């Protein structure tokens, strides 16, 4: 069953931006309803935990700029696994998240902190979301080769040979 | 020129007939062979034009299928342009043809761009265009001027790229 | 970065050769056939080298992660960013291999091994045929 | 520009067409 690749997949939510608008405060809230947000990530678990509790270079800059991002670490350091964190922000139109997974290897002999490993690239441009360059290059080259093949077969069709002259047109 | 001792006669700054300082020009086997071939064919064309004044085929000479056909065209060019009185020119042209690293003008331009993008000395650039070295240290030892002036990683990258650029015969 | 640098220089020379063949085809008068063959063969073998070198360094290209510059402004150059970002094939090639697969259309595996044995048999047969007659 | 005001655009709104009854009419084209 034909599936559109998620790298080119682009979601638009006019109702959400009309109701709430685009801001770093609710950029994760905007991302929550997208298909790219896995329901198995620990961010959703933290979200239900918060809901139950209520019912009952630029990395350091964005680190020190917002306190909710702080709360994100102090709620995310306890849970290791696939997590969604912000990468960088330039207002009022550009935001990009950092898709990384954490394995807090607390074993004896490792003086390093929890291991952070990239998984995917996500770019929020306007109200749209974008998600390999190797594929782009090979696709461009293969389409170029197809066009070249068509041109060369047409040119060879145009070619006419005679023994007494050689090849002419 | 281990210590870049080029003397007064071959200074880096040259005074031309116009009186303006120019960078000293150094050509490897490929560049010199292409330049001399172009000059010879231009002189032959001028001679033919003059003969027509007193009283098509030239496209096949520059484009050679093989080394032997190129040598035959070279012999014909020397017969029709030099007169056969200059054996040293024939020996130099044969040495250029047999050990020309690069036959196509575009590839020679690529080699020139790769070698002189770093801004090295023209002597070193011409030597690198003449010599094919497997390892950076081999070139550095065989070219004492390149020592202490180019990083080993850059030299290795340049040498590997040049080896890849060599057109298969 | 070294692998992508080599890819850059080789693709740049390939694009230069493409520009060449372009501005010698754009002339109102067609040059001699032989010059066209030489240009075709040189550019096409250069494309082969491009493919081979891109094959060699897949790991370095894959390991790299794309990210826009902090200094690069997206508000004014979003069109330029989207131009390079998009990667979907041209449609005509798409329905081209769709019709190709339509025409082509444990069983598949044993046909695959039957193709293996036909290939090996044909190779051996032509080796024998070449050995039969002295070609030197 | 940043405030999306309803029912006043130069060009027809995509959200207007989404909220328009033509969407469900196409969805309920079988019922037609």
């Amino acid at each position: 069953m034909n599936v559109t690749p998620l790298d080119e997949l682009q979601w638009k939510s006019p109702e959400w931006i009309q109701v709430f608008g685009l801001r770093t405060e609710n950029v994760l809230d905007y991302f929550a309803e997208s298909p790219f947000f896995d329901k198995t990530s620990n961010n959703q678990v933290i979200k239900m935990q918060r809901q139950f509790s209520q019912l009952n270079p630029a990395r350091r800059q964005i680190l020190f700029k917002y306190p909710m991002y702080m709360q994100l670490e102090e709620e995310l350091m306890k849970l290791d696994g696939t997590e969604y964190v912000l990468s960088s922000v330039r207002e009022p139109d550009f935001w990009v998240i950092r898709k990384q997974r954490r394995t807090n290897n607390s074993g004896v002999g490792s003086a390093k902190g929890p291991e952070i490993i990239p998984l995917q690239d996500y770019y929020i441009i306007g109200a749209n979301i974008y998600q390999t360059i190797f594929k782009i290059v090979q696709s461009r080259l293969m389409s170029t080769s197809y066009h070249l093949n068509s041109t060369l077969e047409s040119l060879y069709d145009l070619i006419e040979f005679q023994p007494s002259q050689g090849v002419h047109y | 020129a281990a210590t870049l001792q080029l003397g007064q006669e071959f200074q880096l700054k040259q005074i031309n007939h116009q009186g303006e300082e120019e960078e000293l020009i150094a050509l490897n086997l490929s560049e010199a062979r292409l330049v001399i071939k172009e000059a010879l064919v231009e002189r032959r064309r001028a001679f033919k034009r003059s003969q027509k004044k007193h009283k098509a085929d030239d496209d096949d000479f520059m484009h050679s299928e093989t080394r032997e056909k190129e040598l035959e065209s070279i012999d014909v060019l020397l017969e029709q342009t030099t007169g056969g009185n200059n054996k040293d020119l024939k020996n130099t042209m044969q040495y250029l043809t047999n050990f020309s690293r690069f036959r196509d003008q575009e590839t020679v331009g690529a080699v020139i761009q790769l070698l002189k993008s770093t801004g090295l000395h023209p002597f070193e650039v011409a030597q690198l265009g003449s010599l094919a070295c497997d390892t950076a240290d081999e070139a550095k030892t065989l070219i004492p001027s390149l020592n202490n002036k180019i990083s080993d990683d850059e030299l290795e990258r340049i040498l590997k790229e040049l080896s890849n650029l060599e057109t298969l015969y | 970065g070294q692998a992508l640098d080599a890819v850059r220089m080789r693709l740049a020379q390939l694009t230069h050769s493409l520009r060449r063949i372009r501005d010698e085809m754009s002339k109102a008068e067609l040059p001699q056939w032989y010059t066209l063959q030489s240009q075709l063969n040189v550019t096409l073998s250069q494309l082969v080298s491009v493919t081979s070198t891109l094959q060699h360094f897949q790991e370095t290209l894959d390991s790299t992660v794309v990210y826009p510059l902090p200094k690069f402004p997206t508000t004014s150059h979003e069109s330029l960013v989207t131009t390079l970002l998009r990667k979907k094939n041209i449609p005509e090639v798409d329905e081209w291999m769709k019709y190709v697969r339509e025409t082509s259309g444990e069983e598949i595996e044993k046909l695959l091994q039957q193709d293996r044995e036909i290939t090996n048999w044909a190779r051996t047969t032509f080796r024998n045929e070449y050995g039969k007659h002295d070609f030197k | 520009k940043g405030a999306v005001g309803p029912n006043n655009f130069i060009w027809p709104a995509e959200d207007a067409l989404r909220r328009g009854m033509l969407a469900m009419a196409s969805l309920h084209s079988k019922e037609l």
């Binding site: 559109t4 080119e8 682009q10 109702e15 309803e33 298909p35 | - | 694009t15 449609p91 | 995509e14 989404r18």
Partner: peptide
């Protein structure tokens, strides 16, 4: 040096083929 730089071969007129489909909520 560099014999000649490459001519700008930008094609902004290219319409692109981005698939758009997950717009409905």
């Amino acid at each position: 040096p560099s014999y000649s730089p490459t001519s700008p071969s930008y094609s902004p007129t290219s319409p692109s083929y981005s698939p758009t489909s997950p717009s409905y909520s």
